[PDB]
Amino acid sequence: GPEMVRGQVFDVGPRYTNLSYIGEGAYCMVCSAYDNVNKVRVAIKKISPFEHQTYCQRTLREIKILLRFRHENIIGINDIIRAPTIEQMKDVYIVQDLMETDLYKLLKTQHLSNDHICYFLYQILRGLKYIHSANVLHRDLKPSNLLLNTTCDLKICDFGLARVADPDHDHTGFLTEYVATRWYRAPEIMLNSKGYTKSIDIWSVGCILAEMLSNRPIFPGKHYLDQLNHILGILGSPSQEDLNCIINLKARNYLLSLPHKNKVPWNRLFPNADSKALDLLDKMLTFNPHKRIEVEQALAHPYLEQYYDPSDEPIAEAPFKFDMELDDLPKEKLKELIFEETARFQPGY
């Protein structure tokens, strides 16, 4: 019958032996297993999304993106297991390269050399350039979404919150709430942004970089507005012309109402960090999203010159303009669309 893992059913069938449980989630469960056709241990997350209309949007988005992206710094999909019919399908299993750890697990325990920090940051930017070249925004870059194997190869995962970029419809009101992880939110998310620009991802990488320099998140806000307060605590009060790009008065006046606080110098917060690294951190974490450095510009920064090579930093061939309108879609057209996009892995194809 179906083999079990910590109680639940985990029937990944005759290609994947020797189940070895790793973790859980709201609808996830991930296990180690032996891939008999290719003789390598692989990862498998078992998604059970079809009850919540919001979980199918996150599942169809990840699956669609991941299959079209092919990049050494973005996790791929090796296989997909589901039932042969739509109505027998209660689960979808995604087979990925097994990855021993992630940056979150590693920052909790290991203190990174400057060579490691430089290398991990290069790998993030190089895969991000491919994402942005496909006109995709990740929107949830944090350490736990950066996998690593035992030779410190880095791969970006979990495109569940990703959108096709849309800079012309990015503006919104003050305190317009947001799904992505709080500690890595750009300040403009809390002021006037829906997170539909590429600059939303650079800020998160900036945050990852700061956390790599010190094994500590730089802006650990505890609720939605403390986040903005943490950022201004270190960047200092936004300049006049910075404020002169915030047209929304509810956001502009909140900023005016705060007492003047001085910039905290980076060399102070990170006094054994490479000075080249602090200067790029500066450009990645500029308050003004338009002043903020772009991904390809970050790759050509002197801090990464030992690795920089634009001919070896590939861009996507197939960009999206298919924002796919997934959230005007009922229970069933999501399930039927997840069913259709996985067909290329079913036997008889």
Q: Compute and round to an integer the Cα radius of gyration of the chain.
A: 21
Q: Catalytic: which of 35, 79, 140, 201?
A: 140
Q: How many CB atoms lie within 10 A of CB 258?
A: 12
Report the alpha-carbon distance of residue 195 to residue 172 in Å, rounded: 10
319 — alpha (psi -120 to 50), left (phi > 0) or beta? beta
Q: How are the residues of the chain apportioned to helix, strand and coil, as percentages rounded to the nearest 5? A: 40, 15, 45
Long-range own/partner contacts, residues 178-185 (CB < 8 A, 24 or more apart): 178/224, 180/139, 180/140, 181/140, 181/142, 182/221, 182/223, 182/224, 182/227, 183/142, 183/207, 183/217, 183/219, 183/220, 183/221, 183/227, 184/140, 184/141, 184/142, 184/208, 185/227
Phi-psi region of 80 (alpha: psi -120 to 50; beta: other; left: phi over 0): beta
Distance CA 172, CA 78 (A): 39
Helices (H), 134-261: 187-191, 199-214, 226-235, 240-243, 249-257
Task: Please give the angle made by the CA atoms of 23, 149 and 47, to the nearest 5 degrees.
Answer: 30
Residues ≥6 apart with Cβ < 8 Å to 341: 60, 63, 64, 67
Compute how many other C-beta atoms are within 10 angstroms of the C-beta atom of residue 241: 9
Residue 241 in tokens: 């012309």
**Element counts in the chain: helices (H) and strands (E):** 12, 12
Find residue 35's DSSP bridge partners: 16, 40
Q: CA 24 to CA 26: how far, in whole Å?
A: 7
Closest CA to 129 of 346, 340, 308: 308
Query: Residue 177 belongs to a domain with what CATH number?
Result: 1.10.510.10
Q: Are 189 and 178 in contact (CB under 8 A)?
A: yes
79, 162, 222 from 189: Cα distances, Å: 36, 15, 16
Which residue range(s) make up the domain with 202? 101-312
Residue 140: active-site member:
yes
Residue 188 burial by Cβ neighbours in a 10 Å radius (0-12, 13-18, 19+)? buried
Provide the resolution (angstroms). 2.5
Plot region of 95 (φ>0 → left; ψ -120 to 50 → alpha; else → beta) = beta
Give, as one character, the DSSP assignment of residue 263.
Answer: P
